[PDB]
């Protein structure tokens, strides 16, 4: 039974229920994420920005079934074109806007990567990606508004690949956290 999450903490409780089993109902997870109305006071603890690039701030480890984190994007900050390591990846905007660009998996031949489509994700919207859908890049293209997003990955993963837009070549990246449970990482 899917109910509206009243707060971020309630959302987390609901997610624990939805991930209690071995599979994931993507549409249900997306619907509950979308139903949570961002409340900046509830997530201020996690919204730790860096001058130079976006930050990843761990919120919950999902009893091992998922990682829930908050990403903080300064003006002009963006990601690589990347995959999601055979995991489900949900992204919900909590503040601002992000541009998501979709790309196809590269051919083995070196070529300029093919941009499929683009969209602007607005406050409170929840998007979904997985490797079967394709690759993506996420960027805060704003000059004036920092963005904050809530990401859920299941199973958790700590490495992925970044892809060179000019060639399709991939490199393994290890993801790092800026903070965990509100506490800065050393
Ligand atoms: Fe992503």
Swiss-Prot record:
Gene Ontology biological process terms from the UniProt entry: cysteine metabolic process; L-cysteine catabolic process; L-cysteine metabolic process; lactation; response to amino acid; response to azide; response to cAMP; response to ethanol
Catalytic activity: L-cysteine + O2 = 3-sulfino-L-alanine + H(+)
Manner of cofactor binding, per the entry note: Binds 1 Fe cation per subunit. Ni(2+) and Zn(2+) can be used to a lesser extent.
EC number: 1.13.11.20
UniProt entry keywords in alphabetical sequence: Dioxygenase, Iron, Metal-binding, Oxidoreductase, Thioether bond
Entry-linked InterPro entries: CDO_1 (IPR010300), RmlC-like_jellyroll (IPR014710), RmlC_Cupin_sf (IPR011051)
Keyword RNA-binding listed: no
Post-translational modification: The thioether cross-link between Cys-89 and Tyr-153 plays a structural role through stabilizing the Fe(2+) ion, and prevents the production of highly damaging free hydroxyl radicals by holding the oxygen radical via hydroxyl hydrogen.
Protein name: Cysteine dioxygenase type 1
Gene name linked to the record: Cdo1
